[PDB]
Amino acid sequence: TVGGLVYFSSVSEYTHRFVEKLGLPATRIPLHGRIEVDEPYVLILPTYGGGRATPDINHGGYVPKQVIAFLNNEHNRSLLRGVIAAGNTNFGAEFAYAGNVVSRKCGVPYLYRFELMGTPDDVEAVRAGLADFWKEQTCHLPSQL
Numbered sequence: 001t002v003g004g005l006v007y008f009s010s011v012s013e014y015t016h017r018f019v020e021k022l023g024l025p026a027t028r029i030p031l032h033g034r035i036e037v038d039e040p041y042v043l044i045l046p047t048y049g050g051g052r053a054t055p056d057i058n059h060g061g062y063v064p065k066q067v068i069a070f071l072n073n074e075h076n077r078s079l080l081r082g083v084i085a086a087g088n089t090n091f092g093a094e095f096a097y098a099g100n101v102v103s104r105k106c107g108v109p110y111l112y113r114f115e116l117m118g119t120p121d122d123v124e125a126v127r128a129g130l131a132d133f134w135k136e137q138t139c140h141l142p143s144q145l
């Protein structure tokens with residue numbers, strides 16, 4: 001069984017580069033237009049909209065508009081199981097804040113955060129963490145009595 005993975009990456013392609021390094025297959029949310037997915041997934045997304053030294057989870061701009069639109073589709077949203085976020089620690093209290101926003105507002109675990117295209121340690125930690133994450137779903141199977 002392949003873990004479900006969905007990501008967004010802008011013209012700078014840093015999240016795309018991270019996903020390529022992961023060695024796990026993934027579906028990219030496009031710059032424009034609707035897509036749909038069919039099986040449970042973890043979302044990897046970068047953070048935009050920074051600037052506010054004392055930020056608030058509800059202030060808009062952190063989550064890419066294409067991700068908001070993707071998650072407005074009830075079926076896509078129903079299949080979201082967790083989030084991994086990227087950013088730049090120079091943003092301080094706003095570092096990787098899209099992960100905070102998605103995890104709190106969609107009620108899913110915040111699995112990991114990283115900077116830019118990620119380090120080798122980030123790649124390894126995400127590969128191991130995703131494996132452990134999907135294994136934990138096997139603790140939730142229906143009764144077969």
Ligand SMILES: Cc1cc2nc3c(=O)[nH]c(=O)nc-3n(C[C@H](O)[C@H](O)[C@H](O)COP(=O)(O)O)c2cc1C
Binds near residue numbers: 010015046051089115
């Ligand atoms: C306009 C703009 C705003 C950004 N705002 C934040 C931010 O609030 N917090 C953060 O951690 N990174 C912020 N970043 C850094 C990006 O999240 C980072 O460069 C990321 O790697 C971009 O991913 P992408 O190349 O896949 O689009 C911002 C970058 C830009 C260009």
